Design a protein around this ligand. Structure first.
Ligand SMILES: CS(=O)(=O)c1ccc(Br)cc1
Ligand SMILES: CS(=O)(=O)c1ccc(Br)cc1
Ligand SMILES: CS(=O)(=O)c1ccc(Br)cc1
Lengths: 294, 262
């Protein structure tokens, strides 16, 4: 990698993770503002963390305008520094601090269209993200939004095999994960994006559960308790229980009232129970909801 | 359905085809290695098959590790005393990339019978990472096989397991297999497995997908065919032992066909 720390001037802390801290920094030679993610290997008895091996290996190949760019990796014997393109904010802080009276539909459609672009590009390169949530979506001053934080990401085979079950922050986690399915696929990222879409319109989480069973129940009370008709195989799934309350599917205009017919349509297809019928990012880009996108 | 990524398999296949060329080892690296030979590498890889079996690792992990190893030995010259260290760090990196539950570093130290230290394994991991520049998402034979399998009419587990087996055998022998891309060995393996079990041949649908024909596959097939006939005689036997297991339908016990009529 063509970098060294001598050339960066740290500016402030901007975040912190399980393997290190992130600083906003400035390249003293080019002027470029970056985000430096430090991963301490000296405090590690197990060598380079797997999260970091996956983040670097996969982001090095994922070059897309709607995916945060890994600019460089500085690999000392005690510290590993990931140099990232810097974006001034995440979608969550934006929803809270400034989207108080709401996010205008133009910007929501623009954001969602860009998120789908980024995610389609991931899926086209056999990468699941597996942690899409507003905190992990970076926005700049120019109106770009970008997938970020690829530490829970995974390179998949076709067809997929069984991967880690402990995946996706709970509120954003797909039913097929919640029901302990042996296999999950690209549909889990679409689910997350669905939850995010709804969240952008309401500025509140769609399914704010406090446990796996509570999360399922909130999903069921909103979309109805799935049966063999809406989702073949569901009642065979490892954590499906016949004792599950059977709630009725509520009309979708009730789930997100301010949403127009096109919005409702797209959202219903992102939140389809059956992962096989759930819309792909690639197909979603052509949905009528985006006909007027900037 | 979605588990076979219907809206992405082609994009993925094309992208894997591009990546295998970039992740390709130098075909003639062993002649430039002063102290190691194809025979030593065969011993190493056979051992990694055993390690994979012992720790119940995914076959993909095995393939990734071999990729890491050959690519490393393509630019870094290594004394025979150190070859196993390279291989250990390779398996560790491939495990951390591919496994839900990788073995701990200590278990890797343990399987080398304290030839090497934890410190040595860890330092080699950094070195390998430096040499490969963290390019670890490498296309494998398996990645192509599992896609080719979607073209069976109908699916046949004996076909699938025998193809996996044959592809695994190719990992052992740098000559000749270093000169074929994963996608091509996978093709040869798939055709040979299919022919062996059902008498059927490389499907036209896979001609459409891959642009490969029995014509373009012939060189690898003739090599793979020989490798399969000679497999009971090979110095290295861990793959055959592994593929006796019911997990893999005992496919190593099937008889190779004597001719391909190709
Ligand atoms: C240090 S390295 O060669 O592994 C590397 C990896 C990723 C980037 Br982006 C730059 C350099
Ligand atoms: C490590 S990451 O990809 O989440 C990230 C976080 C914040 C910024 Br600003 C850039 C990159
Ligand atoms: C041929 S050798 O003696 O160098 C060797 C290579 C790999 C292992 Br594992 C053991 C021994």
């Amino acid at each position: 990698g063509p970098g060294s720390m001598e050339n960066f001037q740290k500016v402030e802390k901007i975040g912190e993770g399980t393997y290190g801290v992130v600083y906003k920094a400035r390249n003293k030679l080019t002027g470029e503002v970056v985000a430096l993610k430090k991963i301490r290997l000296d405090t590690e008895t197990e060598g380079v963390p797997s999260t970091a091996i996956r983040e670097i290996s996969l982001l090095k190949e994922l070059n897309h305008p709607n995916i945060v760019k890994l600019l460089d990796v500085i690999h000392t014997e005690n510290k590993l520094y990931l140099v990232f393109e810097f974006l001034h904010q995440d979608l969550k802080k934006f929803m809270d601090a400034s989207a108080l009276t709401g996010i205008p539909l133009p910007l929501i459609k623009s954001y969602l269209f860009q998120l789908l672009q980024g995610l389609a590009f991931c899926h086209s390169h056999r990468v699941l993200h597996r942690d899409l949530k507003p905190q992990n979506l970076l926005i700049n001053t120019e109106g770009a939004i970008k997938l970020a934080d690829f530490g829970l990401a995974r390179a998949f085979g076709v067809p997929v095999r069984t991967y880690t079950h402990e995946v996706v922050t709970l509120w954003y986690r797909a039913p097929e994960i919640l029901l302990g399915c042996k296999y999950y696929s690209t549909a889990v990222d679409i689910w997350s994006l669905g939850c995010i879409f709804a969240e952008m319109v309401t500025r509140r989480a769609l399914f704010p559960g406090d446990s796996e069973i509570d999360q399922l129940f909130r999903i069921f009370r909103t979309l109805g308790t799935p049966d063999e008709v809406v989702w073949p195989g569901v009642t065979s799934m490892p954590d499906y229980k016949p004792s599950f309350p059977k709630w009725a599917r509520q009309d979708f205009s009730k789930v997100v009232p301010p949403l127009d017919e096109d919005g409702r349509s797209l959202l219903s297809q992102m939140l389809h129970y059956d992962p096989n019928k759930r819309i792909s990012a690639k197909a979603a880009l052509a949905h009528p909801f985006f006909q007027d996108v900037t | 359905g979605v588990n076979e990524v219907p809206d992405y398999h082609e994009d993925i296949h094309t992208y894997l085809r591009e990546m295998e060329v970039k992740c390709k080892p130098k075909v003639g690296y062993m002649k430039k290695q002063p102290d190691i030979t194809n025979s030593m590498r065969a011993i190493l890889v056979d051992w990694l098959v055993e390690v994979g079996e012992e720790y119940k690792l995914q076959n993909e992990t095995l393939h990734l590790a071999v990729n890491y190893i050959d690519r490393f030995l393509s630019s870094m010259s290594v004394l025979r005393g150190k070859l196993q260290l390279v291989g250990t760090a390779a398996m560790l990196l491939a495990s951390k990339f591919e496994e839900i539950y990788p073995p701990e570093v200590a278990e890797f130290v343990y399987i080398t019978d304290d030839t090497y230290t934890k410190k040595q394994v860890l330092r080699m991991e950094h070195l390998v990472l430096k040499v490969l520049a963290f390019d670890l998402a490498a296309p494998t034979i398996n990645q192509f096989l599992t896609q080719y399998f979607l073209h069976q009419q109908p699916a046949n587990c004996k076909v699938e397991s025998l193809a996996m087996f044959l592809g695994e055998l190719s990992l052992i022998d740098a000559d000749p297999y270093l000169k074929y891309l994963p996608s091509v060995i996978a093709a040869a393996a798939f055709h040979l497995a299919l022919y062996t079990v059902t008498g059927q041949s490389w499907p036209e649908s896979l001609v459409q997908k891959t642009g490969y024909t029995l014509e373009t596959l012939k060189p690898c097939l003739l090599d793979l065919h020989q490798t399969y006939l000679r497999a009971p005689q090979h110095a290295q036997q861990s793959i055959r032992e592994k593929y006796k297991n019911s997990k893999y339908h005992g496919v190593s016990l099937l008889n190779p066909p004597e001719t391909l009529n190709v």
